[PDB]
Symmetry: D2
Subunit: 114 residues, 4 copies
């Protein structure tokens, strides 16, 4: 599993469950190409987005549909989503994209390991 997403709720102190995540790859013409997607599990985790064979070097965008998440909890959010844009690089790389969510704030970190 080369690319994993982890999403947490800073208001309830829990995994953020059933959050839609869309991954895009940057094409040669600079448009964003749909690459992979899913919903976070009960652990707030999203696995099996892609394989090592497909996950070539390039610029990727991970879009976390945070607005819909806060809406379903009855809370008015600030952001449309959270966007994590980065270059995948063969020179470590099991990528964990973690995001902590608040109504008016989010943080994201990359955990890159062998």
């Amino acid at each position: 599993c080369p690319l994993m997403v982890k999403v947490l709720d800073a208001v309830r102190g829990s995994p953020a469950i059933n959050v839609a995540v869309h991954v895009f790859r940057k094409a040669a013409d600079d448009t964003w190409e749909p690459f992979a997607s899913g919903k976070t599990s009960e652990s707030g985790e999203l696995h099996g987005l892609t394989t090592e064979e497909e996950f070539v070097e390039g610029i990727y965008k991970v879009e976390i549909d945070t607005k819909s998440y806060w809406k379903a909890l009855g809370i008015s959010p600030f952001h449309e989503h959270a966007e994590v844009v980065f270059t995948a690089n063969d020179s470590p790389r099991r990528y964990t994209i973690a995001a902590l969510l608040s109504p008016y704030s989010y943080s994201t970190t990359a955990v890159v390991t062998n």
Copy 2:
């Protein structure tokens, strides 16, 4: 000032100086139209991006050029740039402060929204 950006450096314990910022607005046709751009000052702040008249209701994207910043300092960062996307002024004019705290492999961003 209706839209302002503040950036801090979590490695140096300092304002993030000379950080390029590009602001876009979602157009009728769903494309990101260039709206405003600037660079953070010595205080890590960016003011005078727009006016109260030009800053109408819409979906805005604030792109903080974090990679260029860390690179300009001999650090190879994870992110290309931090992207803050939000609907602004949908219940009348508000004033927005987009705050960001930067580490090479992490950032957090928060919004301060006040009613003038």
Copy 3:
């Protein structure tokens, strides 16, 4: 102003107002001696805690009373209070801004350190 505190609310997208702050200094005998205290204003800022003369070299603890804050608003938070412990002024006098961003189950804190 050599020591200042700024607090934001990540739930409301606002300054955290009326947040109690207690500052302690490590004494010769290793105990935490009361140093200064105050409350954040409408801007979420706390100034005038100490002077440049009183703020000598030492290990300081800034206690931001986050539980009291969230409780005063009908939210049951995780943390009792955020604790920022640091050595100050060990290479001559500096000015410190302790910044904190609060969520019910999370906070981040950063330091802005400037040479006057």
Copy 4:
């Protein structure tokens, strides 16, 4: 495992390895009593600090020795440590205390689950 600590490095984008963690319980006389301790593993994780039988309701402090961590990497840190003070409460509770570290900044979150 009622209490788990996870520590990450925001500069290198990795688990923070070999970080000393000390847990204290608040005594009736308001002093901090040594409760449990350890070093974070290669995954930046610390498990088996305590058991359900011992982890009774009360105020606990998790002290993360961040200064020593940054020193060993040759980096001058701001904080003496990171302190996470909280009440353990029987009314969820598998507690994960997560901390993300930078030289002049840290964030911490509680992930509390059933």
